[PDB]
């Protein structure tokens with residue numbers, strides 16, 4: 097007997113089998129199941145993923161909330177989802193998700209060792225493992241991820257292609273504060289000087305995107321100049337790549353990515369670039 | 373979907389074609405059974421096909437793919453038996469409606485990129501000297517399950533360690549599929565059927581009976597305990613001319629970090645000339661606990 101689902105309200109499930117049963121039953125009634133994976137502490141960036149998911153006709157929206165140890169405000173997160181008209185939150189325990197410990201896992205391809213995988217060499221294995229599991233639990237038609245974690249998003253699309261997963265991956269543009277700073281729960285840690293200097297990341301990227309009519313080197317030099325004008329911003333990398341994160345082609349579409357440390361806080365940003 | 377003629381054998385090579393046809397069958401109430409194989413089919417495989425057939429409303433998909441990722445460099449891959457015509461004739465005879473025969477290029481367009489890493493069980497027994505062997509198997513089995521999306525997936529108990537790791541895969545990645553183990557089919561003398569058996573000359577074929585002899589001896593000696601069971605198996609193997617034992621181990625049924633209780637599985641692997649054979653049996657210790 098299928099678990100109780102109440103249309104038009106927030107239905108919370110902690111058991112994987114429960115969310116699995118409700119989702120399967122909803123899909124057979126002609127709903128299209130959309131998955132939005134989060135680690136809770138929700139902000140506007142998450143709500144933008146929510147809104148994209150909601151505007152697919154016949155959608156029912158699953159927001160998972162789960163702090164993944166291989167890679168929190170409960171009632172607040174839940175009230176945000178309620179206010180967005182999300183119908184399912186999936187809130188499992190670590191024991192429900194990992195009932196036999198870490199045993200079989202996903203091993204990402206070589207891209208997981210670069211860029212973010214430099215300081216965190218096992219981070220992406222953890223993320224791919226947890227995403228693969230959420231996909232199998234919920235079986236969504238579409239899964240939504242923000243572009244702010246661009247390398248993550250690329251790795252997810254490799255997971256999906258490589259394991260023949262039958263789901264559409266949707267990347268949603270970065271939601272920014274008014275001065276351009278990419279939204280992230282880490283932004284709250286920045287003191288005023290840091291918060292003011294942090295704008296250099298988005299400013300450098302957008303400057304590069306416009307300098308790019310003058311080519312790749314102009315674009316990288318424009319970005320570096322802007323980063324160079326900021327105090328207390330330790331750049332770990334600034335790299336132009338193709339959109340799949342291979343080597344930048346002589347012209348065409350690319351992606352410029354940056355990561356930097358302000359005090360103890362690590363920030364990231366990235367932007368589409370068109371060369372020429 | 374591409375064409376699907378029922379009551380007949382439909383052969384698809386493109387993952388997209390079998391996935392579409394599979395989905396359509398499932399959207400109209402049939403229950404898709406998957407039997408994954410490396411071809412060179414024999415009666416051990418047909419027992420898997422018959423178990424699948426007997427599931428009501430079933431449509432059976434047999435895949436045939438010699439997966440290069442689970443082989444070690446050094447000739448094993450080029451030496452594997454390929455008999456496609458016989459394979460497909462047997463499936464026709466069994467009333468299988470779907471054969472999935474993908475290309476290496478269709479399965480590995482990006483080479484080895486995203487892959488499955490098994491638990492530590494994959495580093496032991498068969499994986500000890502072949503440490504990437506089970507990553508290859510679990511990767512292709514994951515992909516076949518995502519392409520075909522069966523309700524149930526069938527495997528022989530002969531490759532028992534592989535069956536166990538597959539159940540691990542399925543539990544650990546929350547796959548919505550039931551894994552059915554099917555008992556080993558045996559020659560009249562006891563020899564576990566395997567595509568490898570054709571590689572035994574008549575002498576080796578005569579000697580090979582020692583594996584199953586040792587295991588069933590041990591299963592009956594087991595009333596007297598684990599040591600008696602193991603010593604019986606070992607003595608039988610010691611009396612076999614030309615059998616080189618790789619391992620003989622008694623484990624818990626999960627093969628795992630639990631000590632052996634009253635129910636176990638006894639596993640053997642051995643070389644006759646260059647041919648490596650495996651077999652295993654259920655074992656009940658003492659009372660039969």
Ligand SMILES: O=C(O)[C@@H]1COc2ccccc2O1
Pocket residue numbers: 133134135136164223226227241245
């Ligand atoms: O809370 C978030 O923004 C992150 C972003 O990406 C995620 C990927 C897998 C599982 C949860 C995830 O949530």
Ligand SMILES: O=C(O)[C@@H]1COc2ccccc2O1
Pocket residue numbers: 408409410411439509512513527531
């Ligand atoms: O043909 C066989 O014996 C094997 C049986 O085990 C297999 C496991 C994964 C993929 C194919 C397989 O076929």
